[PDB]
């Protein structure tokens, strides 16, 4: 995988975080913790604190885009959710229409 | 007609117990290279002792079969005593043959190792054969007290 312009997975940066963000406002805490990694990218890039913080700091752009996109689908869920057998009729066809 | 299974199941446990005891004694009398001195000198007592367990349950099954008839009092229902008599004699004959086979299996092999234990193994094997008499005595006492 050493291509110059294509293909290297350019559609995964948009399809990856948008489809991954639909599984989750619960996205506000991920947007705040992902927003702390922007300022903490410089000292955190040379600190190497923890094992998940290293891979999270390497994929900081994917966690920032997926964390920012998670606030929309997270705040949209909790039309409206009141009981079962009502939101599933639209949420069922919503994933097929989006996919 | 439920009393026929109790009479038919009389010697079914005594035949398997005596067959397992004779098979255990014959399987335990294979060794060990010498047959002139001790085997079979006093080792044949377990097969002949366990052989009468099938004859006791056969005699009890013949007495219970001859005592039970279709023209006697058979509308009670009171024919459940034949299952207790035949199962009582069958469990005693099967336990006596099973204990006689396990005692003869170690008593037959124990004679070749030490010759001083031949009186002890025959002394325990002679006393171990008295277990089967309780089922025949209880079956004859139960069959004598009823029809």
């Amino acid at each position: 995988a050493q291509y110059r312009e294509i293909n290297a997975g350019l559609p995964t940066i948009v399809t990856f975080p948008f489809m991954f963000a639909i599984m989750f406002g619960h996205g506000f805490l991920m947007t705040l913790a992902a927003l702390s990694l922007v300022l903490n990218e410089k000292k955190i890039n040379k600190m190497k604190r923890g094992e998940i913080f290293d891979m999270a700091f390497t994929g900081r752009y994917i966690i920032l885009l997926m964390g920012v996109f998670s606030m929309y689908t997270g705040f949209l869920y909790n039309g409206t959710e009141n009981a079962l057998l009502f939101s599933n009729s639209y949420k069922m066809k919503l994933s097929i229409l989006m996919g | 007609f439920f009393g026929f299974a109790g009479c038919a199941a009389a010697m079914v446990l005594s035949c398997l117990g005596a067959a397992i005891g004779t098979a255990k004694s014959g399987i335990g009398i294979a060794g060990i290279g010498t047959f002139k001195p001790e085997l079979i000198m006093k080792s044949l007592i377990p097969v002949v002792m366990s052989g009468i367990l099938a004859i006791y349950g056969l005699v009890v099954a013949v007495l219970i079969a001859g005592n039970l008839s279709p023209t006697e009092d058979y509308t009670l229902f009171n024919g459940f005593m034949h299952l207790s008599c035949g199962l009582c004699v069958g469990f005693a004959c099967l336990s006596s043959g099973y204990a006689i086979g396990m005692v003869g299996d170690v008593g037959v092999r124990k004679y070749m190792h030490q010759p001083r234990l031949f009186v002890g193994i025959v002394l325990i094997l002679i006393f171990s054969e008295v277990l089967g008499l309780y089922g025949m005595i209880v079956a004859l006492i139960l069959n004598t007290r009823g029809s």
């Binding site: - | 397992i20 098979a23 399987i27 335990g28 009398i29 060794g31």
Partner: protein, 345 residues
């Protein structure tokens, strides 16, 4: 119990092992062979056994060094590869672990000897059903735990060297064949109790428990006496201490074996053994062979069980050393010392 198992696989291997066990050297042939000092009387009694077929083909009166090794190797290979090649199922798969456990001791000493920078151009097989050029050279040539686990994983079933390689991978038992041989002897002693406890339901075993307990106590006392005067480490496991009977403690065996010299475990274990208060290695060596030789002819009386084949497979090790020592001593014009002291066969 008896009359409840109908395993035809144990009946076929019991009859095939009984056919070779019928024409073998009994206690009368060993007692008459030990007292005999003539070439015709020694060759006549030993000629009627399974090892006497090579003496019947090649007639001789004086036992040679290469003839005893060739006849013992052909007798062990014919008695092990022939019965192992004709068996199948759980009887052959369980019977292969007995040969793999005996070959694992020579395979561990060859694997440690390969890293030890020692010469090797000929290796004898005692009870190993596999040759020293197909399975022994691949495991002996490899020195990594990944290659030994990958080579041990290809065999079916797994051998006992995988647990010794897994324990020796972290450096928790020893860096020689002594501590790995003692831990492999303890794990091999526990594997016989695990297999005897697992096969206790289907097959009836009574002589295998007494022979495994007496052979485990004599193997633990012999392993504890072998580490005496050899600079045995008290912290590392080298005496083979473990509960197998109920009257042997690990502090009494390891403490009396390492530097204490306390024979109270021998008298406390039993009073009918050959050595219970002795302290000499010569009398304890013949007493361990006389105690290990017991429970072999009495276990051969019962049939239709693997307990007779378990003691019958272990009797060939003492029978090969007694036949080689009696044939080498009688052929070499000398008197037997260890064979003359032993009377229990």
């Amino acid at each position: 119990m008896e009359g409840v198992y109908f395993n035809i696989d144990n009946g076929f291997i019991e009859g095939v092992v009984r056919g070779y066990r019928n024409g073998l050297l009994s206690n009368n042939q060993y007692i008459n062979l030990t007292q005999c000092d003539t070439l015709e009387d020694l060759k006549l009694q030993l000629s009627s056994t399974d090892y006497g077929n090579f003496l019947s083909s090649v007639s001789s009166e004086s036992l040679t060094t290469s003839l005893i090794q060739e006849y013992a190797s052909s007798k062990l290979y014919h008695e092990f590869n022939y019965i192992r090649d004709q068996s199948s199922g759980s009887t052959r798969k369980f019977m292969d672990y007995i040969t793999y456990g005996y070959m694992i001791d020579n395979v561990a000493l060859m694997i440690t000897g390969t890293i030890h920078d020692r010469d090797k151009g000929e290796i004898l097989q005692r009870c190993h059903p596999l040759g020293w050029f197909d399975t022994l050279p691949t495991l002996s040539v490899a020195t990594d735990l990944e290659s030994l686990y990958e080579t041990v994983l290809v065999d079916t079933p797994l051998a006992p060297y995988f647990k010794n390689c897994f324990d020796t991978a972290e450096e928790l038992d020893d860096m020689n064949i002594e501590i790995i041989r003692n831990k492999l002897y303890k794990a091999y002693l526990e594997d016989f109790y695990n297999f005897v406890t697992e096969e206790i339901p289907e097959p009836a075993k009574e002589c295998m428990q007494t022979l495994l307990g007496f052979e485990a106590d004599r193997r633990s006392i012999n392993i504890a006496l072998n580490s005496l005067q050899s600079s045995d480490i008290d912290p590392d496991l080298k005496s083979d201490l473990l509960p197998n009977i109920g009257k042997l403690y690990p502090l009494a065996t390891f403490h009396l074996a390492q530097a204490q010299d306390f024979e109270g475990v021998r008298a406390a274990l039993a009073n009918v053994y050959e050595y219970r208060g002795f302290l000499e290695t010569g009398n304890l060596e013949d007493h361990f062979y006389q105690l290990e030789m017991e429970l072999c002819r009495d276990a051969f009386t019962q049939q239709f069980a693997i307990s007779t084949v378990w003691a019958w497979m272990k009797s060939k090790e003492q029978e090969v050393r007694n036949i080689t020592w009696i044939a080498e001593c009688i052929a070499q014009n000398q008197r037997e010392r260890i064979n003359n002291y032993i009377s229990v066969y």
